[PDB]
């Protein structure tokens, strides 16, 4: 039941992991998720995509040696994925994107 911006944001800083309703792109694919058919809720009820490495190809997120970035989807319930993500670092810095990793803003 945790897929809101604050909910997951608080959860990560604390429990240092994502809530149980999250699976990676690969777990989802193994379960039958086909991106082109927006069927995730049919193959993985109650789940949202989260936990894959975000490479930060365009250096938009603050780099540091030893630091890794991960993403999770936000406000997902069913259908095609939306454009909202939570970006979190190994050292628990939290950012949000609402435009498909174009622009980023700090939230914690």
Residues with active-site annotation: 71, 100
DSSP state of 34: -
Query: Any bridge partners for residue 80, and if so which?
Result: none
Rounded (5°) CA angle 68-72-74? 145
> Residues 105, 96: contact at Cβ < 8 Å?
yes
Helices H / strands E in the chain, number of each: 3, 6
Alpha helices, H only, 2-39: 5-15, 25-30
């Amino acid at each position: 039941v945790i897929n809101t911006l604050d909910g997951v944001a608080d959860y990560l800083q604390t429990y240092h992991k994502l809530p149980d309703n999250y699976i990676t792109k690969s777990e989802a694919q193994a379960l039958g998720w086909v991106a082109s058919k927006g069927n995730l809720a049919d193959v993985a009820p109650g789940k949202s995509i989260g936990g894959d490495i975000f490479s930060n190809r365009e250096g938009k997120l603050p780099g540091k040696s030893g630091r890794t970035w991960r993403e999770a989807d936000i406000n997902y319930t069913s259908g095609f994925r939306n454009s909202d993500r939570i970006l979190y670092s190994s050292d628990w810095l939290i950012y949000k994107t609402t435009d498909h990793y174009q622009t980023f803003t700090k939230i914690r």
